[PDB]
Amino acid sequence: ETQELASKRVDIQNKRFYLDVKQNAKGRFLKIAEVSRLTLSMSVAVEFRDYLGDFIEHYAQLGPSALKSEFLVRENRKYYMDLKENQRGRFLRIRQTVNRGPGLGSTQGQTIALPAQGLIEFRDALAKLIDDYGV
């Protein structure tokens, strides 16, 4: 039975993300729901934490007006991370795909969009779930 060990809430402009660390008898993993839904192993969650730091850095150094991308393939899942910008402002979009195993053949590629203002809070929340629970 998958039982959540912790929830986390991050408010950014008028959007909300929940970071739930869950564990079924397979192991421990992270879920990230918007106001779609990513699922990450803790090991992959570490890579995100660090990549978020890369993104934060780049955003702080932009100054006034993709800007930056990362490409991650881990355990049958592929993650695209694009720091972009548009009329209303800068954001980080994260798309999760199945590129192998059960679930291939799609209708369900997952996506979340974080406003850039909240990357630091979102990274800080992730970091502490890693901190507490480890890999």
> Residues 49-88: x/- map of binding to a copy of itself (CB under 8 A)?
xx--x--xxxxxxxxxx---xxx--x-------------x
Q: Is 26 in the site for a copy of itself (CB under 8 A)?
A: no
Q: Is 113 in the site for a copy of itself (CB under 8 A)?
A: no
Secondary structure (3-state) at 18:
strand
61, HSE (Cβ side, Cα atoms, 13 Å): 9
Cβ-count burial 68-83 (b if 16+ within 10 Å, e if not): bebebeeeebebbbbb
Secondary structure (3-state) at 74:
strand
Q: Is 91 in the site for a copy of itself (CB under 8 A)?
A: no
**Start-end of H helices in the chain:** 42-62, 119-133
Residue 36 beta carbon to a copy of itself: minimum distance, rounded to whole angstroms:
11
**Applying CB under 8 A, which residues contact a copy of itself?**
4, 7, 9, 11-16, 18, 35, 46-47, 49-50, 53, 56-65, 69-71, 74, 88-89, 116-118, 120-121, 123-125, 127-128, 130-131, 135
